[PDB]
Symmetry: D3
Subunit: 329 residues, 6 copies
């Protein structure tokens, strides 16, 4: 219910809440690697969000090293305006209890968002919320840590509305294309990409028009997230070299209404920040509409505008302005 929904889960925990900042790129780093950890302060200034990875691609015998590594660099660095995230290990894993506990105790006040792998339903959120609450109380954390659900299974997608509404800590969703495709039996040629042979064959009179595999999944993620006041994110794109397909894929997500994407390499940072910023062409035709009608009321014009298009324009202009603090247009 609404009455106890906003009440704290544990006594001494901070009052429940979305904070407004740009989240165009979520940059992942391996905490166990000294070379990457050494340059975190310099790299943090080049990204909107910086996310520590304890999960996929961190070896079993390096879980404790990655965990401790994350804790060292988040304690010692001033991250300025860069949001600090962490992806902990899965809720069925041998590392998750230690992950969450240690990170809250040492750097809880520094952590904005916690990414939970493979969220299957509201019960997963209920556990993380209550656990974080008790740990926040224990270590006197002033600002509650938000929860970001990674969608990696069919059950999760089916349970998306329940997951979205399970806690006031919810921040958003990221698509986990590798695992989600594997779960569904969905076949793709690149992580976070489509497939060349998914398309319609024209009637013999032959051409083959390729279709997007992720349309339903993204459209669904965006409706559920936005209806709850959360943010949807495209996850990673796995083919680091194919920069044109990355931009194509990221751009599709931006237009359907995602806020950002993951970067898994330095070359993906500029693509993401570029793509999830509004195109200056559209900001002009947008500012044209805001100028045509001073307020929401009215009609304009060879395309019909109104209060609705004014709202469409306000979205694109409210975003392009938040980012520039740069384009500056």
């Amino acid at each position: 219910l609404p009455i106890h929904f906003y009440k704290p889960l544990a006594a001494g925990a901070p009052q429940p809440i979305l904070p407004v900042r740009p989240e165009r790129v979520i940059h992942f780093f391996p905490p166990h690697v000294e070379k990457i950890r050494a340059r975190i302060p310099e790299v943090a200034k080049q990204v909107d969000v910086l996310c520590g990875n304890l999960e996929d691609a961190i070896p079993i015998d390096a879980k404790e090293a990655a965990r401790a590594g994350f804790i060292e660099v988040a304690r010692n660095t001033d991250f300025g305006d860069t949001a600090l995230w962490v992806r902990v290990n899965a809720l069925n894993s041998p590392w998750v209890l230690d992950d969450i506990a240690d990170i809250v105790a040492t750097v809880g006040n520094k952590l904005d968002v916690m990414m939970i792998p493979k969220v299957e339903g509201p019960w997963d959120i209920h556990f993380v919320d209550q656990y974080l609450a008790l740990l926040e109380a224990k270590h006197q954390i002033q600002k509650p840590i938000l929860i970001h659900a990674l969608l990696e299974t069919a059950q999760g997608m089916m349970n998306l509305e329940a997951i979205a509404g399970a806690s006031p800590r919810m921040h958003g969703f990221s698509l986990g294309p590798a695992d989600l495709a594997a779960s569904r039996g969905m076949k793709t040629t690149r992580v976070g990409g489509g497939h060349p042979f998914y398309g319609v064959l024209a009637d013999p009179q032959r051409p083959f028009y390729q279709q997007d595999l992720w349309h339903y999944t993204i459209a669904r993620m965006v409706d559920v997230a936005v209806a709850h006041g959360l943010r949807a994110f495209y996850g990673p794109f796995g083919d680091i070299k194919d920069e044109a397909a990355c931009e194509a894929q990221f751009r599709n997500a931006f237009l359907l209404g995602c806020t950002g994407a993951w970067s898994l390499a330095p070359n993906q940072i500029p693509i993401a920040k570029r793509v999830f910023s509004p195109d200056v062409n559209e900001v002009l035709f947008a500012k044209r509409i805001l100028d045509a009608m001073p307020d929401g009321s009215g009609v304009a014009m060879g395309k019909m505008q109104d209060d609705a298009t004014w709202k469409q324009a306000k979205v694109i202009v409210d975003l392009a302005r938040m980012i520039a603090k740069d384009p500056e247009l």
Copy 2:
């Protein structure tokens, strides 16, 4: 949410019996018009005969300074005109606005007996339907309105998309849904200012052999709307196509909607009327397979098979609807007269 035994009761003493089935009539085009401007007011009796459905507009595209005028406007023209077979609809202001109380009050008081459907903008959930249902019921009772004013839901918000089943099932007054892709794009945060066509940057990039195949922004949205609506015996509609000039694009979008299963589209100017009518006219193969259902089952009883497909009371009742709707279109189009065969 309501139990069947109560669902079909009138919400006010004296208010008209809630309907069981949707009234069957032409709705291939819904022609919007600003009622505050006298030039268009004067042509309404002309335009009325051109269109299946006429719909006055009090909400978006009507400035704050002329809302009152759009209200009076709508009543003036509705009083004076006999609309014949053309349906009279109205789009009132939002349920949070200062104009909606009087919008609904004065219209039922003056022209309720002529108003066929009321269109509610920015519906978030079933509570919205509930209020309007109950408010209409009480107003219909006061002014002794003879048949229930139906509710048409504008699908303009993320919350509405999420709550689409609850909305569809909230009232027997429910007629159907119209996609409002301008508002729905602002609500979702879809990054376009365009009002519901393709978009150049939404597409798939092929593998190195680089071709770029545009995709349809609204496949999920319309597919979802058709399923929910049709499951509840309601009608989905595509809404506005804001690029008035680009008739090539408008036909394609109207045709997409038609093939997914919508019943009709909006027209925002005279050039879109004939396009909407062309696209949304029933499939000839549809109409002729229905006639066969009807002729093979004398009084809709028993069971008969046609092209290897068993037919029954459900398929017969859907046959009589499509045939009925065909005849009604043929009455004001000669091409479709012999096409369906009337």
Copy 3:
């Protein structure tokens, strides 16, 4: 909607224990046949070995005066034949129809111990499953059937699509779903030029190019939503999603392309309406070699299936291991009657 503790109980005294897991077997092709035609019935034992699943048809395209022949035909062929590895299905008549009572009761009374799945047309909600589930259970106890007859639901109405979660979870007899695109298209205001396929006029038109006259028109797929929705619900319930039939029996390319779109989204298999379609299905819905090879690495890294491991960066546990055993056991069973794949899967 039933409680877990009651879900797996038999609905009749003497009915066999319901399953907690779909049997794993090849289901790449569901080959249909009219059991009334005596020439097809003669060739069934030969056709058996060429297909993963043989499904008798009593419903669409079996005439009213043929219904009782098809019912007896199917009972006759099933009693005479030993299907070996081939699964025996049957699409009975609709739940409003005059034949369905006798269809189910006669088939279970006679050959119930040989039927693996029963296909129910035009399933509109959990109530339809509840009827069939309870009916089968009482027939199964009377005739002492040894393993449960599963229910396969045919998606033919808007109502069904909207109630798909409720259908999927209605019973432990649930096997999965097939799309009936002719009916589902009719039910929705959907326009299709062929039963299996979409429409050429469903497409996106480009913005005006200053240069050329011809604005490009990119055809779109009508069935994307439907199939993506069908796969998510089915897989989330532990069931399988199947594409239905493709009508243009001539058009083998279109048949390959639509079968393939379904496979790439996660469907297990397709219907074959004609002998040319049989090999088109088996080719497309064969498990991918990479998935099979990868699954073998999981099984190797976790011998007894316990503990936890990490392969290609990814944690492996009792769920991934169990899932990897399913595809390996399925690849084995396919390689058993297909030496070309035995080499590819590396057995």
Copy 4:
């Protein structure tokens, strides 16, 4: 569950249209009879006159080797007897039993157009209703039954009590509910000293008072929760709630107490197991209950006023003292 647009459609082609409103008639007593016994079958034409409802029993108290005889017995009396205004009901065997498929099939075939209500034992949830609903429809169509046979749910398990709202709204065939006291008690693990009874040791002990050592023990009603929940759920769905059996045949006083309690809480009637219980039920469950007496009146309370008036006249059309007393 099902949507209002589809709720009232037939479930088989040729099956009679679902009712939108429950039929009004006296249901003060539902008199059970074992149809395998020849003596009782003889007396049914007489007994039909003395009861509002006659219910043949195929389930409890009918032995395993008498099931076929009971199934045939009930059919014999069904097609012979002219029931007049007396409604005819049957309690088939449970849905998990080896007799229920033939119970329903044979009865609908032979005497289906004389059956008003079918009583289903041990209704656990809406799935049980879905099965019976769909099965009756297919049998109704095959045999061209002219009006729908209604479903009356026996509540005999805790699950059924928990699923009560979902059961109630499962089908427009739904008529209402009866208490299966013995079986509901045994499912819950309640302890009663008689079927349909209660327990003298369920009570509230007073505090010690003054100097009087004897602390009074106030007995409590065990069924108050059950019947209150059953009535609220039944009446909200437009159905009727009945008290089940009262197994202590000889204690006519206690029988009256229990039936009266049900009636005061809103139940329509009760079962009679023997002929001494017939008059107890009819006595106890017999009652006439704009702006008059401070309350507004409308379409809703006019319909309910007409239901009680019609019931009174039909009650009166056979009962002359009550015809004289009600003023008809």
Copy 5:
């Protein structure tokens, strides 16, 4: 929906309140506003009751609806209710008087009305209508504090949908039992409005010697009141016993009210002057109980552990039981000098 629950449902109307106001609500005194003699003495009566509630619905004849409407507006406009809350029971949602009842009252005296009681509520849809309608009116007439909603439970359907009704809006205040209408809706038989029946009871088993079987009467309203309390309290709302119709049987009235109080109801209605003092006495904590509870709070300053007090043993939980009783006692004592004395403040 929790983010959209606490939004204003109209632009101009005030922010939906985060929690209920904290005043005593032991008696809800009803008055027919169409009667001049009654309106004249409302300022005097108001000083003796926690809540005063105008009635436009039942007991008001059809001829008097306009007069009762106008009479309520005139009383509320001219009177200063002080610490007394002002309610009104408007007519039913299916009736020809309700549109005007709500509209006229909000326009004229919206800033003086604390709670609007809605008759015959059957589901959350009823609540949706009123919330939205009040929101629009409040905006139009710039009403500073939002008018709360109070649901009368007078139907089986209402009892069945109780959870949905309670969660339907943040305006929700609580529930009152409408036991006459609820008995009729249910088919109950009561001998009095909102009262038990003499013949609802248990017959003891046959004895050996006395041969008169004792007959232990039972409470018709247990299930109902227990369900209302649980649902209301679980949503942060208050439950109220409705009207006790038998004005002259003050013993029965007291007993019925007290039963409600024990099971967790906050107050009951008053229909006549004799019921005012009964409701205030019955819905005020007992003196001894308050004192027995007073020293528990002393025995455990922390509210933690065990502690012997007189002969009894208390723990964290009985401390909570105690804090409730004492918190209420201290609130009533602010405006009753006599109870303040006896409670020991």
Copy 6:
């Protein structure tokens, strides 16, 4: 809210397989003890033999400053004791409390293999259960716990009463519910300080006789609702504490009410309550005898038989087994009942 296909899966790799059926054992009396009191701690090996269930208590009645001693105390006496046929329970602190994280981790780490049931207080909804389920599993995998630790939900809050079905269905760890009358009275705002008996001024006043007041049962609705939700989920309902230790006549009456409405057993707060709970909640003899008959009429437990006009089947056979088994295990330590049941 979880599907049956996922419901019986462990929530952590290494965690024991969830159960599909409650263990059957005597649970007529839940004896509570404060584990921080050495004098009581020292007697537990003897008291253990006198009771069906022993439940350590870390929550209400344990002072704030004794909470850590109470935890350590529970661990000490559980480590060093062979509880034989007696079940070991613990009531940990509330989920919004500074002691509960460590309560659970430490108990599971040290004595998790001896712990049968973990009682959770002040349960408000399924989310509480979800948290405990997932927490226990991660600890169970970490410490290689062989059998799943079950969850007992204390019914003490108005929210818990309203959310009873969701709580009951939330996990295959669910054991059952105990009515916590003091906390439930405070939560509801019931106007009593008594802990779970009658109240003299809750009653029905009769009409003038040619004026008797019949006291009513405060807890009819609450127990009736608890029994229905729990039995439908294959769980067990229990009456909680009866606080008036002196008044044994009232305690027996309140326990018997619970028993007559379908509760399995009650809490004992003092040694005089132990025999009372044991006496009241022992299976009635006609229930055991009728159960014996069901097993004899169907030696296999298969097919369909009939007894006293009532069809018997695979489900009723399953129930008769439970009762007989339970009566057999009670006889094992009580010669008097052994006779009455026929062993």
